[PDB]
Design a protein around this ligand. Structure first.
Ligand SMILES: Cc1cn([C@H]2C[C@H](OP(=O)(O)O)[C@@H](COP(=O)(O)O)O2)c(=O)[nH]c1=O
Ligand SMILES: [Ca+2]
Length: 130
């Protein structure tokens, strides 16, 4: 309750940040509840590429704010991002390309969903968990 919103993509940045045109400012958005490696750390180039293609290839790009703060202290948007109905945040965790991270109580609606995904990635020893 939680609603999605069309997202306009300027460019993918790395595993867990993307640049959107949001009411027609260029704005970095940071993915809620996850942490990908930096572009120059192990699985960093893979996380970047996964997010990039996932959002680029989607006909329908959406942003969904949580119930709490919509920007962080750095002025980045904080959201879940969906590509043709699939959550990027979740897909990264499921593939072992992001850890569940930065879980704040104002903004934690999809926590249990991402922890389930993380547990599957862990069990499978996938990427980060290898
Ligand atoms: C994901 C997320 C990060 N942050 C902050 C925490 C970290 O701040 P500090 O810089 O003070 O440690 C930083 C991590 O982002 P990155 O993982 O993009 O570097 O962004 C939030 O404030 N809210 C959030 O929802
Ligand atoms: Ca990161």
């Amino acid at each position: 309750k939680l609603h999605k919103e069309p997202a306009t993509l300027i460019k993918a940045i790395d595993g867990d940040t993307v640049k959107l045109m949001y009411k027609g400012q260029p704005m970095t958005f940071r993915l809620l509840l996850v942490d990908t490696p930096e572009f120059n750390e192990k699985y960093g180039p893979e996380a970047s590429a996964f997010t990039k293609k996932m959002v680029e290839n989607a006909k329908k790009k959406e942003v969904e704010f949580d119930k709490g703060q919509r920007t962080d202290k750095y002025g980045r948007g904080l959201a879940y991002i969906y590509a043709d109905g699939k959550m990027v945040n979740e897909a990264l965790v499921r593939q072992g390309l992001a850890k569940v991270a930065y879980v704040y109580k104002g903004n934690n609606t999809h926590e249990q969903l991402l922890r389930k995904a993380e547990a599957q990635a862990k069990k499978e020893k996938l990427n980060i968990w290898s």
